[PDB]
Structure 1
């Protein structure tokens, strides 16, 4: 196919996209905040269909997430390719700030961090004439310097080059050179409903820069975007097509009733007209749509998330994520190919890493389920599935060990000072329990199946887990977890599979 695609191109929690072209291959990275591994890494041949090939930050030495939460950890990343080397540059705001890692093979383990001198966030690199130029946004000014990207040494003084058109929170700077102009693209307006992309240019990389009279080049903040199901379009990165066409990846989100979003900021694609000696124009009127009826590069489908993920390979795919730095020894694979989680007393509301491993929710309408076999449990030990936004904002569905060798299914909502037990239901002595979470745009629905019978446990509003309600920079994840109620506990839980099916 050479025509038409659906947005978002990477659904669910995938913000701040940056992309690079390496020959006929495209590589893309997203911000990941408090989650480990960090900086998911995607590959495409057409900019539409993406396979997650790994993550850039896969080892604790690359990624200290001590006390990280949805408002901290890893912020926007940028990926670049130059002279056979890939660079990923980002900020760990919970740690030592701006750094990069590099590799000659994106599928391998990337380097240890190279810490950088210039401050602010949203660092980016541009290469020319054997030089490596870094931009970032300290004190709201886009600053430029030259660096040695292998040693981290700053080679020239930082220079303030632009501070945008006047909008709030000037960020996400990237430099491109085209038609003898240095173009400087940024985000303004904040990453909520006022998000916009603006652009300026200069004959000199160090300015002065003049803004495009047509700014902003992409936004749904104005009348033209007010009725769109997509809002908050911004944080773009321009990339060339294999046929000489132009494109941008950007973040946005899909709004829900009352102006909420729970799937995070996702990655979207837009075509760009960029004639010789002209300013770029994004999809004719600076808006994007869910159904994009436009010409594309020759399309090639990629592997996606299985509807039934099993653990027979004794490894988790790159899609799975933990909270902060996990205790690796508490995640093992059994001889018969189940995922075994080892209990600790850390709850999902402790602001520390629990025994917890999750997949991003990627559809409004979905069903997820897993069988749970809780073993060697003391009273009040529990294991199950959590619909998780933040340590103070999550819905937990679980099997619990009770006194006198009894067990129950519980449903608990954590919302700030509320911990609400919606249901506590006695289970039969025998029978494997499958826990089930469904959703539509309005509600999560909870249930369980045992001895061939499915039981409804009730429903809860989606809005209380939104970014607007809960705060932060992330989306809902669906996590398998286990928590013990004693230190003395030897409890563990086996999960034979994880099912996830989204409606397109």
Structure 2
């Protein structure tokens, strides 16, 4: 029935929520705006985007945020007639500190106007709100130890949240230090039977990733660990197509069945490479997958063993599939950009991105460069398949080399490639390739750039991705296409390639316009095409 991953491309830290016979997953969005993506399902198999809750500056202001900062794992729950969303804005993602702030927002409906944030704490990321049977609410998060002689993951801290007072109350207490796997985060609490079950993520979000579960009769512990822990992990299964299985949440379905959503990375093909030396590169980033649970001796178990199964049986419900929610060829005739498009860190107002200036086109007024953590005129969507074609059609008249417009495949500010239109002193309006690898820039088509003739209004830019490699191509008529003679490698746009390890997103493809001269020169994009191949 259900093939994994259920959410493909960039979809980490899945937090699942049941409301009656409705099902929701919220995933982390990091530096991409708006914050948080919530998907809905009736059968746990088919999923559609229904909410992007953190869409106001008052809720989320990520200007300047480092790559892989911002919205880390979110927590979605429902209680007392409303949804509760807990989220972090992480400001520091390298070194001894992980400075970041936890906030609560609520809404009556999944896609309404969510509240302005209530500040919770800053002690660590992976905040989760637990609603206990007595009406009392509790926040769990990881507690961060910055000290040099110390492992940073100090364990799971718990504190009561007062809905009345709109603040944490009493004293924070450590309830669980984790197992020897350490890197203990992603805590979620469940009152099942006579027990509080504490689900955590351990071993880090790379190849040693795991989901650990423990249980106690006291909310404050101590928690005895699952006798066959890890509950879930891909570490001992180097040939499993689904790696990095961890950061899970549990769902007890209305049909009295149990499932476990978790993140996973799907490495590119690795034939002829040493199985264990390096375990792979994931351009799709961390995706969402689902597993069935079964119960033995007051403990949950993953069906099929503690590794992730590629395919599982769904709950005992009627299949409810969803109509496609984007046009493969999006001609920009809508009044609002399709919801699979995101922007970097900030919302882009009509002064930067507009569907109104020239009907049927997305107009991007040129802002800062592809290396900027501030204001980029960039509108992008996820890679959601290993095999796809993405394509745009743009009219652009750059009068200086400080101006550019193109199709970009982007991981972060220091890691991207692009086929762009720019201006050159002798050659005039030109097409070039530009790549950035850990801030180091290459122009592989120097000085051999494609001269664009004066009488061409639109340049058509395309990328074809084929798993390990991809290629750019262009047309001046949309019919006769010419490949650019550089073969690019998809692993360079993957989490695993990034030297900082603050690499928690995934590859995007989008439309960019830079104007470094500050003359407000703009690009008109007639369509954006994304098509699985």
1:424-456 CA deviation, whole Å, 9 max, x = no partner? 211232232110011112112100111331000
How do residues 269-288 of structure 1 correspond to structure 2 at under 5 angstroms?
269-274=290-295, 278-288=298-308
Distance 2:425 2:184 in 1: 57
How do residues 406-445 of structure 1 correspond to structure 2 at under 5 angstroms?
406-423=428-445, 424-431=449-456, 432-445=458-471
Aligned length: 495
Q: 1:96 to 1:142 in 2, by over 3 A?
A: closer
Q: 1:280 to 1:96 in 2, by over 3 A?
A: closer
- Alignment TM-score, normalising by the size of structure 1: 0.94
- 2:474 pairs, out of 429, 448, 459, with 448
2:393 is the counterpart of 1:371: yes
2:489 is the counterpart of 1:466: no
Aligned partner of residue 167 in structure 2, secondary structure: coil
How far did 1:168 drift? 2.2
Unaligned 5+ segments in structure 1 are none
2:519 is the counterpart of 1:481: no
How do residues 73-152 of structure 1 correspond to structure 2 at under 5 angstroms?
73-94=70-91, 97-117=101-121, 119-128=123-132, 129-139=134-144, 140-149=154-163, 151-152=165-166
- 2:56 pairs, out of 55, 59, 62, with 59
2:359 is the counterpart of 1:336: yes
How far did 1:193 drift? 0.3
1:186-237 CA deviation, whole Å, 9 max, x = no partner? 0110000000111111111111211111100111101xx2111111000000
2:18 is the counterpart of 1:6: no
- Alignment TM-score, normalising by the size of structure 2: 0.89
How do residues 148-187 of structure 1 correspond to structure 2 at under 5 angstroms?
148-149=162-163, 151-187=165-201
Q: 1:376 to 1:195 in 2, by over 3 A?
A: closer
Q: CA RMSD in A?
A: 1.8
- 1:495 pairs, out of 510, 518, 525, with 525
Q: 1:379 to 1:181 in 2, by over 3 A?
A: closer
How far did 1:469 drift? 1.5
1:135-188 CA deviation, whole Å, 9 max, x = no partner? 111142211111124643222211211112221210000010111111111011
Distance 2:155 2:385 in 1: 37
Distance 1:401 1:151 in 2: 59
How far did 1:465 drift? 1.9
8 A Cα contact 1:327 1:355, kept in partner: yes
8 A Cα contact 1:40 1:52, kept in partner: yes
- 1:267 pairs, out of 273, 288, 293, with 288
8 A Cα contact 1:444 1:461, kept in partner: yes
- 1:231 pairs, out of 243, 247, 258, with 243
8 A Cα contact 1:220 1:231, kept in partner: yes
8 A Cα contact 2:211 2:248, kept in partner: yes
Q: 1:330 to 1:17 in 2, by over 3 A?
A: same
How far did 1:403 drift? 4.3
8 A Cα contact 1:17 1:29, kept in partner: yes
Aligned partner of residue 497 in structure 2, secondary structure: helix
How far did 1:493 drift? 1.0
Distance 1:376 1:464 in 2: 29
Aligned partner of residue 464 in structure 1, secondary structure: helix
Matched residue, 1:386: 408
How far did 1:64 drift? 1.6
Aligned partner of residue 13 in structure 1, secondary structure: coil
8 A Cα contact 1:114 1:150, kept in partner: no
Distance 2:182 2:327 in 1: 41
Aligned partner of residue 271 in structure 1, secondary structure: strand
Between stretches 124-133 and 112-121, larger displacement belongs to: 112-121
1:398-426 CA deviation, whole Å, 9 max, x = no partner? 12234479322111111135311122211
